[PDB]
Amino acid sequence: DEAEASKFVEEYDRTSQVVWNEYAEANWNYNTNITTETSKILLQKNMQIANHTLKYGTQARKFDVNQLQNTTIKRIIKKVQDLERAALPAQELEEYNKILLDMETTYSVATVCHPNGSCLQLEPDLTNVMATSRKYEDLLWAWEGWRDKAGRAILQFYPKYVELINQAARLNGYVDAGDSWRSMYETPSLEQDLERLFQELQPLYLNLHAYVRRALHRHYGAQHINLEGPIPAHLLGNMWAQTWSNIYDLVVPFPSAPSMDTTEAMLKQGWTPRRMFKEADDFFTSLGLLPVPPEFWNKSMLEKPTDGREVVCHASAWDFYNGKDFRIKQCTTVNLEDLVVAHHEMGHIQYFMQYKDLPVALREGANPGFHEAIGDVLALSVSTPKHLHSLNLLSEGGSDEHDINFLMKMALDKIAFIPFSYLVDQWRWRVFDGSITKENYNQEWWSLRLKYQGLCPPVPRTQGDFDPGAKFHIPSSVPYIQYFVSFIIQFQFHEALCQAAGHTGPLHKCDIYQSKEAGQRLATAMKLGFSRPWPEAMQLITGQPNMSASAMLSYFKPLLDWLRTENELHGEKLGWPQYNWTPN
Ligand SMILES: *[C@@H]1O[C@H](CO)[C@@H](O[C@@H]2O[C@H](CO)[C@@H](O[C@@H]3O[C@H](CO)[C@@H](O)[C@H](O)[C@@H]3O)[C@H](O)[C@H]2NC(C)=O)[C@H](O)[C@H]1NC(C)=O
Ligand SMILES: [Cl-]
Ligand SMILES: [Zn+2]
């Protein structure tokens, strides 16, 4: 009856803490020390956690969740009824676990080399090339090289991966893996809600796109930019053209109003990766939110190791299910882009700390988008010229020209990301549901790159190419839609918190630093964890239960008016009517 259900939940929680804590550190040691020994221990602990998941997941399935009164106990048991990979027969499970490891390792050790010269890693080398080089062929070298070495090498593993992850999904009651991933949001209208939100950001994105295309035309020449076509994917300062902020020097709306070199400022003033996290820690505590434990500073990998060992460099935050042990793993470079990233990862850590008293099953964000959005919200305030100047990193100010410059800087990071973050799982959901087969992987990737982002490949794609594999989340099997949700909702959070802090006038000038009223709304929402449906947490922060693009539109409203006037006087076509155009 009801007593057996709550007894089971107690027992699940006690044993999960112990086994999840042990899997986490085995996983940590591989991620921070990629060897054969650490690989083998991880694969052994994989079967141990599966053994636990199988045991309690089988017991969970004997209960009737909707025939149980307490909804909190109902919520936990339903979740435990999902075995994930542990639903696969023993042979399939080890094959799947090996495939995952082999995709992750291949991506992380991939290098692009000159014939008789240096071998370059993605971070920081190729990253730096995409950010700083302004030569078409040198950008092309890194862009094509990374796809030849990382993307092409992932292709051999992917079809089998898709089969095994879909098999696990079906055995847990889903139709495919995409269906399983979407279920995390507990929102029947998810796909429609997301498309509506994407459509609302069209006026802003098409105008940014057109403006940037014009500036690329000016710099890279008329023979390489079609003013009515898609932009070549290697020219936006980022390996995946997901954020366009590194090409700010090519697009600055008012060159007469220049801003400080932030990296030069950081490096000169002796900014260390450690200081960047200390400053993020300060922002959280200023809001009355929890500080990171002394253990965090002892066990975290806050920069790339010098011992010449292989690591997973991608930035991640870690919960060890201790209630005491939380870590960040990041190959941090001393610049503004990574300062934003440091806050984002610290946002994860705060979330871990805020819901640490809940049963481990409920230890997750309201939805995965919420988990991503926390650090980004605070970072929106750090990014203001007024806050950056107070860190001695800028000098921008009370001026209309500097104001439009800042909004362009923010838009190249925030608006540009919208179509990309949307695109990734659109391709992926259709791969899981069978709409896209291995014969059309890459072609359907680029149809969507064209359709949503208005980008084209600088070099025509050949057989054997698998460019999705050259993006971290693909071989690592981490979903991507949260980042889309995060970017919409983080402005909703920013708007509400700014109001709660008593700030008036344009939204983009708001800095919530030290606001205890804003901290309170965040804390109460974060404490809920995964115990309640997400619209409850949305309500707690914003005073309303919906996802909405209004906050983002309002934030960038001054920029949209400026972009419309600017694109109008140059006679720009919005979009890419000549959609079949590729470089000669
Ligand atoms: C359904 O079962 C759940 C879980 O057993 C019940 O939720 C629990 O309710 C108690 C209060 O009735 C919560 O305790 C409170 O929180 C802290 C303790 O850490 C304390 O500072 C407060 O003063 C208060 O005692 C407890 O946290 C909460 N547990 C969870 C996991 O949410 C719930 O009451 C049951 N529902 C019904 C309708 O009976
Ligand atoms: Cl690509
Ligand atoms: Zn994140």
Author numbering: 40 to 434, 436 to 624
The publication says:
The chloride ion is directly coordinated by Arg522 in the native C-domain, along with Tyr224 and a water-mediated interaction to Trp220. Mutation R522Q also resulted in the loss of the chloride ion, with Gln522 making strong hydrogen bonds with the backbone of residues Pro519, Tyr520, and Ile521 and a weak cation-π interaction with Tyr523. In place of the Cl− is now a water molecule stabilized by Tyr224 and a network of other waters themselves linked to Asp465 and Trp469. Furthermore, a sulfate ion was present in the active site, making direct coordination with the zinc ion and surrounding residues of the S1 subsite, including Tyr523. The replacement of Arg522 with a lysine or a glutamine causes a decrease in chloride affinity, in agreement with the structural data. At 0 mm NaCl, R522Q shows a marked increase in activity over both C-domain and R522K with Z-FHL and AngI, suggesting that additional interactions for the 522 position beyond chloride coordination are important. The most noticeable effect of the R522Q mutation is the greater kcat values that increase with substrate length and are even higher than C-domain for AngI. Taking into account the structural data, it is likely that the lack of chloride coordination allows for more freedom of movement at the S1 recognition site, particularly for Tyr523, thus resulting in more efficient catalysis. Chloride coordination appears necessary to stabilize Arg522 toward the catalytic channel, thereby promoting catalysis of substrate.
Somatic angiotensin-converting enzyme (sACE), a key regulator of blood pressure and electrolyte fluid homeostasis, cleaves the vasoactive angiotensin-I, bradykinin, and a number of other physiologically relevant peptides. sACE consists of two homologous and catalytically active N- and C-domains, which display marked differences in substrate specificities and chloride activation. There is also a smaller testicular form of ACE (tACE), which is transcribed from the same gene and identical to the C-domain of ACE. The active site for both domains is contained within the large central groove, with the signature HEXXH zinc-binding motif residing on the α15 helix. ACE activity is dependent on chloride ions, with the degree of dependence being substrate-specific.
